[PDB]
């Protein structure tokens, strides 16, 4: 009934051309051609080209909410592991401005999802800082990927704007569960604790104003320092 909103903002190309010129099998081409709106509910195993690349996905049912009693914290969990394990409606990819893969979480999301993720990214012209692109998740257990570009260094309005762009696209398109990674921390140099407070603060904001639209915001903390910082902040 609705066309998805796939970019939160308003609108090198040789590389994009080369990525898009690569041959596809007929089975891969059929996956790539599924309309973005249908991917959420399609039976992915009905497509002969598809498989899930994560042997034991983590489902909503397996996540421990921070506090079941609380109207907000029943919808938040922490996960000790990579965001790519999470079988949710979307996971967040901490991309760069080119939005064509890279190192760290960007690179691992591309490896698990398979080469169609890169190909879909090559159909649009990058992602501005503060904004979010939506793509299918291909071989990930999660249905979609929310590609966001965080700021370099400690720019709080810009980082807030990432979390807003992500949560706003999720609400508009009916994505009810989101797996977050730690945007702008590590090599982009946003200090970990202040970044974490922005992430949790914006998420709380959304959960207060839009209770019946979001079932679960999961914060995947692959590293120990990330996990302990989030753990201390939430309870």
Numbering used by the authors: 11 to 21, 38 to 261
What's the publication's text?
We named these proteins as Trypanosoma brucei MacroD-like protein (TbMDO) and Trypanosoma cruzi MacroD-like protein (TcMDO). We show that the trypanosomatid MacroD1/MacroD2 homologues are hydrolyzing both protein-linked ADP-ribose and free O-acetyl-ADP-ribose. The macrodomain fold (starting from residues 99 and 92 in TbMDO and TcMDO, respectively) is well-conserved between the human MacroD proteins and consists of a central mostly parallel six-stranded β-sheet surrounded by five α-helices.
Crystal structures of TbMDO were determined to 1.95 Å and 1.2 Å resolution (for crystal form 1 and 2, respectively) and crystal structure of TcMDO to 2.0 Å resolution. The two crystal forms of TbMDO are almost identical with RMSD of 0.4 Å. Upon binding of ADP-ribose, eight water molecules (and a glycerol molecule) are displaced but no large conformational changes in coordinating residues are observed.
